[PDB]
Design a protein around this ligand. Structure first.
Ligand SMILES: Nc1nccc(-c2cccnc2)n1
Length: 215
C-alpha cells in the first residue's frame, strides 16, 4: 500500500535567505570551520539534556550516553554529524532553523561584505548556516523527548521543508547530514577530519568518535 506523508515547505526569513546566498555564492578560505559550528551546537544540546536530567532523570530514558559521532561516507559523499543531545521540538526547528529572524543576521552580512572571515559566523548566532560552505544540501534529523522525530532539509534556494521522519529512529538527539559539493570531498578523508577536529574542537566536554568505512 502506498504510504502518505505530509510535508510543509517554508520560506526562510528574508535576511536568513540573504545570508545563505552569500555563504554559497562567495569564495571563502577556511570553509573547514563548518565542522566546529556543528560540533558546538551538539555540545550545547548535550549540556541541555545533562542539566535537565538532574531535575528529571527520566529524561535519559531515551539514552544515557552523551556523545558525538562523525561518519564520512565516500560512496554517497556525505559527512554526518550525530549527537545524543536535547534534540529539537517542531517549534524549535521552525524557530532555530529558518522562519524566525535572528538579531545577528544583518550584522553578520555587513561584517562579511566588509571582508570578515566566515569563521566569525558563530558569534552572530547563525553558525549552523556555515554548513553551506561545503554542502549543496543539508538534512537535519532530530528527536526531542516530548515530541516525535522530524526531518528538516534544504538545498537553500530560499526554502526548506519539515516533515515527521519515518526513517530510522534515533533515541534522542540531532543528526546533521551534509551532502557535499564535488570539490569539497576532502572532508570525507579520515586524516582531514582528525586534523580539523584537533584544530578547532578540542574543548568539547563529551566524547567524539570518528567512524571510518573500510577501504
Ligand atoms: N545539534 C543540535 N542540537 C540541537 C539544536 C541544534 C541547532 C541547530 C541549528 C540552530 N540552532 C540549534 N543543533
Amino acid at each position: 500500500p502506498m504510504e502518505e506523508e505530509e510535508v510543509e515547505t517554508f520560506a526562510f526569513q528574508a535576511e536568513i535567505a540573504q545570508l545563505m546566498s552569500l555563504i554559497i555564492n562567495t569564495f571563502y578560505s577556511n570553509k573547514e570551520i563548518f565542522l566546529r559550528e556543528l560540533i558546538s551546537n551538539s555540545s550545547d544540546a548535550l549540556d541541555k539534556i545533562r542539566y535537565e536530567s538532574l531535575t528529571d532523570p527520566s529524561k535519559l530514558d531515551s539514552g544515557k550516553e552523551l556523545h558525538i559521532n562523525l561518519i564520512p561516507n565516500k560512496q554517497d559523499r556525505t559527512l554526518t554529524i550525530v549527537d545524543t543531545g536535547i534534540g529539537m521540538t517542531k517549534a524549535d526547528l521552525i524557530n532555530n532553523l529558518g522562519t524566525i529572524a535572528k538579531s545577528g543576521t544583518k550584522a553578520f552580512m555587513e561584517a562579511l561584505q566588509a571582508g570578515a572571515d566566515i569563521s566569525m559566523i558563530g558569534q552572530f548566532g547563525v553558525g549552523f548556516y556555515s554548513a553551506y560552505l561545503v554542502a549543496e544540501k543539508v538534512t537535519v534529523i532530530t528527536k526531542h523527548n516530548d515530541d516525535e522525530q522530524y526531518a528538516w532539509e534544504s538545498s537553500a534556494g530560499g526554502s526548506f521543508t519539515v516533515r515527521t521522519d519515518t526513517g530510522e529512529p534515533m533515541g534522542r538527539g540531532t543528526k546533521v547530514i551534509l551532502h557535499l559539493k564535488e570539490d569539497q570531498t576532502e572532508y570525507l578523508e579520515e586524516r582531514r577530519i582528525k586534523e580539523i577536529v584537533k584544530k578547532h574542537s578540542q574543548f568539547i566536554g563529551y566524547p567524539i568518535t570518528l567512524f571510518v568505512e573500510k577501504e
